[PDB]
Design a protein around this ligand. Structure first.
Ligand code: CA
Length: 159
């Protein structure tokens, strides 16, 4: 009872938690620093999916996202933009094949990136992101083992 009642309390100034990557200096290629998440249902060819999230970076940038199955989808994608203040993102794209992974291409970026409230909605509205709130951890978010950075969750920096 007590746990449930606590969970229902709205409180905008309670500590929020977000995904945080300290990227450091820019690398040479897009693919030199990648962050991965897998939709809980494989994306289907011909269906349009909408990536929603809020994002903040230490410098204004484009954030490239390539969906991936047996082939990579370079266009159209849910790639988006970030600024130094939290902004909301909503980007739709039609899958052109069966896609099982979203690749965040962070290689050419420098500094810091924070993300939160990540959703991926199929045409009916089903959310295919298992862990988009980061209030416990960043389970489900991975990287190549040889990419030397840490995937963390932290208190929202702008609170
Ligand atoms: Ca959160």
């Amino acid at each position: 009872q007590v746990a449930y009642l606590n969970s229902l309390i709205t409180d905008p100034n309670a500590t929020k938690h977000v995904l945080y990557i300290h990227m450091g200096e820019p690398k040479t290629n897009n693919w030199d620093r990648e962050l991965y998440v897998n939709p809980t249902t494989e994306l289907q060819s011909g269906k349009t999916y909408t990536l929603k999230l809020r994002v903040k970076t230490s410098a204004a940038c484009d954030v490239t996202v390539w969906p991936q199955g047996d082939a990579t989808q370079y266009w159209p994608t849910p790639s988006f933009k970030s600024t130094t203040e939290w902004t909301t993102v909503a980007q739709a794209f039609e899958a052109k094949s069966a896609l099982k992974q979203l690749r965040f291409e962070l290689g050419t970026l420098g500094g810091d990136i924070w993300m939160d409230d990540v959703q991926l909605l199929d045409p009916d509205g089903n959310n295919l992101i298992a862990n988009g709130t980061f209030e416990e951890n960043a389970d489900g978010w991975t990287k190549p083992s040889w990419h030397e950075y840490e995937i963390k969750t932290v208190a929202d920096p702008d609170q």
